[PDB]
């Protein structure tokens, strides 16, 4: 039931590695301070997303055993998880407690950022569904590691090697769910179920960005590799 010493070591190591990201306050303070045009928000998005890719590669490299995987499989895992990890991190920031009325303004500002209405409803439905799970910091860090170490990604040659790296993270998350929320025995299953909803953001990620209400969609060379954009 309780975490073993090795699992406690793994958990604190994943947490330390995950904490190298930008502070949620830095991100939300900028959006809440003043309203920006769709052009200004697109530029904020590309800068934020390019920095997230860099942080994600650094976190991924720290995952136990990731460096021992086949080099082509490493690329496939990174490319297959980058968009999902960016949305899961946006969902985490969206659901951080802010003073009265601030989350309403944050939501209204994102709704009016330049993104098309067809993508707003599935995006907020996911952020709100994530928020109802009342996830802790450790749960977001482990879920992000689980999303990266998905053995079912397209182009993965050695799935078993990936399964072996993912299995101890799933074991730790399941124990945490049983500890954090003993009143809700479905908590682990609902966290894993949300991972299925997260995968839907892959199919339309390129269309979401290209349909942003701006004249020119200029991306960075690193985003062009990770996203399916020119």
């Amino acid at each position: 039931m309780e975490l073993t010493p090795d699992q406690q070591t793994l958990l604190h190591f994943i947490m330390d590695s995950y904490n190298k990201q930008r502070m949620p306050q830095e991100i939300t303070n900028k959006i809440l301070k003043e309203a920006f045009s769709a052009e200004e928000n697109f530029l904020i998005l590309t800068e934020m997303a390019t920095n997230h890719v860099q942080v994600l590669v650094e976190f991924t490299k720290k995952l136990p055993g990731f460096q021992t995987l086949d080099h082509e499989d490493q690329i496939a895992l990174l490319k297959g998880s980058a968009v999902e990890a960016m949305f899961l991190r946006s969902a985490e920031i969206f659901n951080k407690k802010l003073p009265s009325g601030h989350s309403d303004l944050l939501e209204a500002r994102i709704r009016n950022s330049g993104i098309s209405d067809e993508y707003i409803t599935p995006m907020f439905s996911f952020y709100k569904s994530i928020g109802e799970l009342k996830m802790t910091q450790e749960e977001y860090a482990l879920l992000t590691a689980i999303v990266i170490l998905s053995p079912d990604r397209q182009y993965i040659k050695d799935r078993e090697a990936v399964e072996k790296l993912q299995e101890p993270l799933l074991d730790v998350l399941q124990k945490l769910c049983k500890i954090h929320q003993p009143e809700n025995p479905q908590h682990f299953a609902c966290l894993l179920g949300r991972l299925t909803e997260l995968r839907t953001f892959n199919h339309h990620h390129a269309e979401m960005l290209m349909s942003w209400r701006v004249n020119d969609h200029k991306f960075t060379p690193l985003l062009c590799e990770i996203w399916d954009v020119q």
């Binding site: 860099q54 590669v57 490299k61 080099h71 490493q74 690329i75 990174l78 490319k79 060379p221 690193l222 590799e225 990770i226």
Partner: peptide, 12 residues
């Protein structure tokens, strides 16, 4: 090609 990703993965 994913040359920037490959570079970020293979550095250090």
């Amino acid at each position: 090609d994913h040359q920037l990703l490959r570079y970020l993965l293979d550095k250090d």
